[PDB]
């Protein structure tokens, strides 16, 4: 029961963080943002925009990291929400170069039982390559996961 409670608590936190991250990403890709940037493009205002953009990217990265961590924690505990591996792998693949989600996959992503990634085998094997390397390189971690 303590495990089941942890799984639900981790899943709820992951969903909230994912919602906030998706909101930030949608605002980034939204037409209002590009319209505001174009209006700026027409000297302190440029600096203010740069600070705002940097802080927004920082918030997006923070929310993404929290969501990934909580998804990893949720998948470890039990088996009712195995289907959230789809969201987890989508977040990982889209954010290949974060170097923090890759680190968390290298450390705690390996602890996940391997059978949970089975529905995503086609896409995972399609994405995997050899361009990136290193301990935290995306391709190296993906190759290790495929091998396991």
């Amino acid at each position: 029961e303590l495990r089941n409670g942890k799984m639900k608590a981790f899943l709820s936190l992951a969903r909230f963080s994912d919602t906030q991250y998706q909101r930030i990403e949608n605002y980034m890709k939204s037409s209002e943002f590009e319209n505001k940037q174009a209006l700026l493009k027409r000297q302190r205002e440029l600096e203010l925009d740069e600070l705002a953009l940097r802080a927004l990217k920082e918030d997006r990265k923070r929310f993404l990291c929290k969501a990934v961590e909580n998804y990893i924690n949720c998948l470890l505990s039990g088996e009712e929400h195995d289907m959230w591996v789809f969201r987890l792998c989508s977040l990982w693949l889209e954010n290949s170069g974060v170097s923090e989600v890759n680190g968390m996959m290298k450390r705690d992503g390996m602890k996940i039982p391997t059978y949970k990634f089975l529905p995503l085998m086609y896409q995972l094997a399609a994405r995997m390559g050899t361009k990136m390397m290193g301990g935290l390189g995306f391709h190296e971690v993906l190759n290790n996961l495929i091998s396991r």
């Binding site: 909101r23 949608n26 209002e32 209006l39 205002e45 203010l48």
Partner: protein, 312 residues
Amino acid sequence: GRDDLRQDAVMQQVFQMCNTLLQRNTETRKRKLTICTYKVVPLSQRSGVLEWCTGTVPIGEFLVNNEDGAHKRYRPNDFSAFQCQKKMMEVQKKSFEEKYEVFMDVCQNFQPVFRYFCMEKFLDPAIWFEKRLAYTRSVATSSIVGYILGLGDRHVQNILINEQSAELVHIDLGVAFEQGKILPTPETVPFRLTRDIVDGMGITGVEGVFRRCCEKTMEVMRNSQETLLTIVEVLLYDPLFDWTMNPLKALYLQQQSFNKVAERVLMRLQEKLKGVEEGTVLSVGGQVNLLIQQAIDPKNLSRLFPGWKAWV
């Protein structure tokens, strides 16, 4: 002089149409929910004449006047408005967390005193209650209508309160249709619902009459979404309407792509009317709750322009 008044006139016409829609519905008609309106007669591109609302005073003049403002007669030991404005201007260039800390520090030492308006002007408890109820209802209907039309630049000097009736009148309607968010240091609130306006409502704040009037107005807005959509669609394609924000107005406010931006504004207004917010369909109560929390959030208020005077 040297100003364009056509935008104010057409905003007034849209307000009149919204008043008719509110009058048609029984639920709002019982509550006497109306939008205060005035006659604007533009005479040229840069000149015009318009009605003077007698018996009204700007809320900024009543609240934060330096010589006889409410925040000086009341709470004399608190920060003066000058110190608050100076601090908020100083923290402008700093990071967001510094902005939040400075804003909360100012708000802690600058407390609302707007509740005493009706208390001092109306000494009979029955009249005081009636005027306070009218004030709350006016705030609710004005906030909802402004959110629907995306009204912006709602600073202290752009709102008038009628001394006799204790009702709020909105002026200087140049910026609308969510164009304030395109500005530098963008506005992040649907409507002005700062601590003074909330305090003037009463001890209940937004929990009582204000929330319910907001849901009733929002429901009326929803039931007439198609007529409102047609009215706004006719309005925006006016060649002389000139609503799109341009850099000159952007610098002035703070010291064909037209088809695409117009259709974007139409879809945004349609989403507002049906209640689809951040991609999730919402009930009238849920949409009202979201709008209220976005309006009263100190996080959003801190990032605003000091000219907007969020602490006020």
